[PDB]
Structure 1
Amino acid sequence: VPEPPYAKYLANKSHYCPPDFHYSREIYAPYGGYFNDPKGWRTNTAIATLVMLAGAYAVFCFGNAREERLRAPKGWIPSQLWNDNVPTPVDYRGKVL
């Protein structure tokens, strides 16, 4: 059947799409289409990674401000490098480090 005029605007079948599989290309889904692989994906993924790192920075700031350690660690913990609220480590015997 003669493809409708709008069919030119729609994308083709992707490389990952099995050749036999037929899907309607007009349907829109937020998660993406049947096999995706859009052009410009590399840039979108780089932007995503940047937004992920920025949000990780914000989350790290928030956590550090809200992370309350009320009991001294038994030994040195990595948090000391970045957070200054760690109580001085005391060992099992009781000696301060």
Structure 2
Amino acid sequence: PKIPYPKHVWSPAGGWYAQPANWKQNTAIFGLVIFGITAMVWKYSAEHEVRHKMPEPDRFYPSRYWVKQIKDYERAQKEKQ
């Protein structure tokens, strides 16, 4: 059973058994807002990460694809001979 609860109380967390009929839609819009901030944060963290050591080319270091410090180093290091 479900405990009785006052209908007149408004709580932003939703309350006692809140699930709006449009919960799927709102859960998608908020996900997109959540996604965009992370993209904004990821772009920041790619730009301002600092490393004093550079990964070897063969090793699994997936950050070399999106960070600027390593990409600039690898671009410059490709010039040989």
TM bucket, shorter chain: 0.7 to 0.9
Match status 1:82 vs 2:66: yes
TM-score (norm 1): 0.63
Ranges in structure 2 where 5+ consecutive residues have no aligned partner: 75-81
Q: How many residues align?
A: 70
* Runs of 4+ with deviation above 6 angstroms: none
TM-score (norm 2): 0.73
Partner amino acid, structure 1, of 2:24: R
Ranges in structure 1 where 5+ consecutive residues have no aligned partner: 1-17, 89-97
> C-alpha separation between the residues in 1 aligned to 2:16 and 2:48?
43
Higher-helix-fraction structure: 2
Aligned match of 2:14: 32
Q: 2:27 aligns with which of 37, 45, 48?
A: 45
- The structure number with the bigger radius of gyration is 1
Aligned match of 2:47: 65
Structure with larger RCO (C-alpha < 8 A, sep 6+): 2
